[PDB]
Amino acid sequence: LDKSKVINSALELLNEVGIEGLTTRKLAQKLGVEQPTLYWHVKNKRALLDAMAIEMLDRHAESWQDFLRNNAKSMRCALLSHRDGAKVCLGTYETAENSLAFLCQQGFSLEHAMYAMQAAGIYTLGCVLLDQELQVAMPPLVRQALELKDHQGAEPAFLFGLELIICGLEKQLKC
Amino acid sequence: LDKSKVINSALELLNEVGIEGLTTRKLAQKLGVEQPTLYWHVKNKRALLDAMAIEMLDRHAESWQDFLRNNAKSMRCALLSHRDGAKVCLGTYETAENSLAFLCQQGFSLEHAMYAMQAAGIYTLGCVLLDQELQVAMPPLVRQALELKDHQGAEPAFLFGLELIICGLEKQLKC
């Protein structure tokens, strides 16, 4: 039993039971150890999720604009990888640092560069958080909304929101 | 015991116990009825949250841009009104319809008008969802991020993200 072996069953197990379902006992059970053994690889449910989150991102995660774009898209992908995958991400260094330079090398007031990182990430995050709950969960205007909304999903909505964000980043830069 | 009386204790109770803590039993207890009585006013925990959510929005919730702005800000306010207030909103008609016209009266392809509603709402939502978890939850670039981030909070980040969104809405309109 290495730590890899734990984190990955954790992810399978996630798929089966959901984030509320995912207990250290249930994990111990699947892996066929006893609960205590697990603590050699994980502090507790918190530290474990934080580990699961990372792995998701490892696995499923040039101009500046088309950095932001490709960063999010991958994040977004990474989140939808698993049940309740966004909820996991919610509650959780070098890659950070690079980014904020690679941003400031294109004339970005660090502060702003942060807020750019943040805006995209938070949005990507909200979108998926929401694709994932509608899972768990008329007048005439609405219905086509809905039916076009259904025909398509959220990927358009995702991208179209990703797009305004970038647009406004061009504008708040020229200043 | 009217229904108002239930929903409001529910909100107090929320503050005390959090969303995971908020059981129908715990509510029955506070109100000093028995569990069954509550079902006369609420189907179950789901229908109850859906009710709590509404009330929050009732209570704490011109150009088009400055509709989107003022809509979100109020939503955002409304969410931070209570513990886990965004998590409640997550899992949950006329006001809808108006909006989508009031949008199309300014030359907005319904579809887009939807995606505009959506983008702002989802972002507002992600932001607060995140103000609320950091509650529940270095190289040098980062630290000032952090320290400026701490000095200020998220309200700047909120607005600055709200702002790009609107910017990009002006651009995706001129087309």
Amino acid letter, B175:
C
A146 vs B: CB within 8 A: no
Which residues neighbour B88 within 8 Å (Cβ) at sequence distance 6 or greater? B14, B19, B49, B52, B53, B56, B82
Distance CA A167, CA B171 (A): 8
Distance CA B125, CA B134 (A): 14
Place of tokens 């040039």: A62
Residues constituting chain A: 175
Phi and psi (nearest 5°) for B25?
-60, -55
Which residues neighbour B80 within 8 Å (Cβ) at sequence distance 6 or greater? B86, B128, B131, B132
Nearest chain A Cα to B140, which residue? Answer: A97
Judged by CB atoms closer than 8 Å, whether chains meet at A167 and B166 is answered as: no
Classified as helix, coil or strand, A87 is: helix
Whose CA is closest to A63, among A172, A170, A174?
A170
Measured between alpha carbons, how far is residue B71 from residues A51, A149, B9, B78 in Å?
A: 37, 21, 27, 10
Task: Give, in degrees to the nearest 5, the angle at Cα A6 between A5 and A7.
Answer: 100
How distant is the Cα of B126 from the closest Cα of chain A, in angstroms? 5
Classified as helix, coil or strand, A62 is: coil
Which residues neighbour B86 within 8 Å (Cβ) at sequence distance 6 or greater? B79, B80, B125, B128, B129, B131, B132
Judged by CB atoms closer than 8 Å, whether chains meet at B161 and A122 is answered as: yes
Judged by CB atoms closer than 8 Å, whether chains meet at B167 and A163 is answered as: no
User: Residues B110, B42: contact at Cβ < 8 Å?
Assistant: no
User: Residues A172, B171: contact at Cβ < 8 Å?
Assistant: no
Measured between alpha carbons, how far is residue A75 from residues A131, A160, A169 in Å?
A: 14, 16, 19
Distance CA A118, CA B127 (A): 9
Domain ranges of chain A: 3-55, 62-174
Chain B residues close to A127, C-beta within 8 Å:
122, 126
3-state secondary structure A92-161: CCHHHHHHHHHHHCCCCCCHHHHHHHHHHHHHHHHHHHHHHHHHHCCCHHHHHHHHHHHHHCCHHHHHHH
What's the token pair of residue A88? Answer: 């996991």
Domain A62-174 class in CATH:
mainly alpha
Technique used: X-ray
Chain A residues close to B93, C-beta within 8 Å:
138-139, 142
User: Residues A53, A92: contact at Cβ < 8 Å?
Assistant: yes
List the CATH code of the domain at B3-55.
1.10.10.60
Place of tokens 């600055």: B160
Exposure class string for A27-40: b at 16+ Cβ within 10 A, else e = bbeebeeeeeebee
Distance spanning both ends of chain A, measured CA to CA:
55
Nearest chain B Cα to A160, which residue? Answer: B115
Which residues neighbour B55 within 8 Å (Cβ) at sequence distance 6 or greater? B7, B8, B11
Judged by CB atoms closer than 8 Å, whether chains meet at B172 and A156 is answered as: no
Amino acid letter, B12:
E
Spell out the alpha helix ranges (H) of A32-93: 35-38, 45-60, 65-80, 85-90
Whose CA is closest to B50, among B42, B62, B40?
B42
B104 — alpha (psi -120 to 50), left (phi > 0) or beta? alpha
Contacts A–B by Cβ distance under 8 A: 147
User: Residues B18, B84: contact at Cβ < 8 Å?
Assistant: yes
Place of tokens 């797009």: A163
Residues 84-143 of B with CB under 8 A from A: 90-94, 96-97, 100-101, 110-112, 114-115, 118-119, 122-123, 125-127, 129-130, 133, 136-139, 141-142
Nearest to A97 among B142, B157, B171 (CB): B142
Radius of gyration of chain A (CA): 19
What's the token pair of residue A96? Answer: 């950070």
A174 vs B: CB within 8 A: no
Judged by CB atoms closer than 8 Å, whether chains meet at A122 and B123 is answered as: yes
Judged by CB atoms closer than 8 Å, whether chains meet at B139 and A93 is answered as: yes
DSSP chain B: --HHHHHHHHHHHHHHH-TTT--HHHHHHHHTS-HHHHTTT-SSHHHHHHHHHHHHHHHH---SHHHHHHHHHHHHHHHHTSTTHHHHHHT--HHHHHHHHHHHTTS--THHHHHHHHHHHHHHHHHHHHHHHHHH---HHHHHHHHHHHHH-SHHHHHHHHHHHHHHHHHHHH-
Resolution in A: 3.1
Whose CA is closest to A162, among A57, A63, A60, A73?
A73
Distance CA A27, CA A165 (A): 40
User: Residues A171, B167: contact at Cβ < 8 Å?
Assistant: yes
Place of tokens 């358009």: A156
What's the token pair of residue A152? Answer: 């398509």
C-alpha A28: how far from its chain's center? 26
Distance CA B56, CA B78 (A): 6
The interaxial angle of helices A140-152 and B111-136, nearest 10 deg, is 70
User: Residues B91, A130: contact at Cβ < 8 Å?
Assistant: no
Nearest to A129 among B90, B93, B171 (CB): B90
For chain A, the residues before each gap (C–N > 2.5 Å) are 61, 92, 137
Distance CA A80, CA B124 (A): 21
Chain B residues close to A119, C-beta within 8 Å:
123, 157, 160-161, 164
Distance CA B118, CA B66 (A): 16
Amino acid letter, B76:
R
Nearest chain A Cα to B137, which residue? Answer: A91
Whose CA is closest to B90, among B33, B133, B151?
B133
Distance CA B69, CA B172 (A): 17
How distant is the Cα of A71 from the closest Cα of chain B, in angstroms? 17
Distance CA B80, CA B55 (A): 13
Which residues neighbour A91 within 8 Å (Cβ) at sequence distance 6 or greater? A46, A49, B133, B136, B137
